[PDB]
Amino acid sequence: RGVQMLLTTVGAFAAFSLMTIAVGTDYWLYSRGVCKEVMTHSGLWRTCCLEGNFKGLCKQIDHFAEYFLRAVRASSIFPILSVILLFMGGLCIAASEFYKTRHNIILSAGIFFVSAGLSNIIGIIVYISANAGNSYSYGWSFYFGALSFIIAEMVGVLAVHMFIDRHKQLTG
């Protein structure tokens, strides 16, 4: 109770700024591929060739029972959901310079920090199991999303650590 008033806010800002990078950069996975069998660096929507004449060329990838999991991969929805959740957590804490002492202003944030985390779990597990369909190796955006998760798991704890003593002051 004190300096934590501000310092606890900071990590969400990094986690959110990191998380958007994985949704667009074509650096999820290294493999061979085709821009027409040369090497390629792989994205969610597309892949791009390197080590050959097609270096810097790209083409889309498309896939239209596990029919619903296929659709979930084709939309790749969960990153957008977790991003929205974490941003709404930030919007919850962003108010805290006004409407102070409501307690709800702090208590309402924790759900977003949990839910974005859990959302990343399913996003990861679906993405890995689908693309697994050999010396392959994970591109750095995987580590970016993992790191975003790692920081996102902090502020859920910090939200309670901030809230609880002010409810205690009303309850004993």
Binding site: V157, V160, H161, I164, K168, T171, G172
Partner: protein, 41 residues
């Protein structure tokens, strides 16, 4: 008054580590929303 219960962050960590290897832990949740996570994990 918060000491009416005790499953704080550190104890809510330690519960998991012992639960993960069958050795268990010195406490376990009383209420349903607490019990159910052990009842899945």
């Amino acid at each position: 008054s918060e000491s009416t219960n005790e499953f704080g962050i550190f104890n809510s960590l330690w519960f998991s580590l012992g639960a993960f290897m069958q050795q268990g832990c010195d406490i376990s949740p009383r209420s349903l929303s607490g019990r159910i996570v052990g009842g899945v994990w």
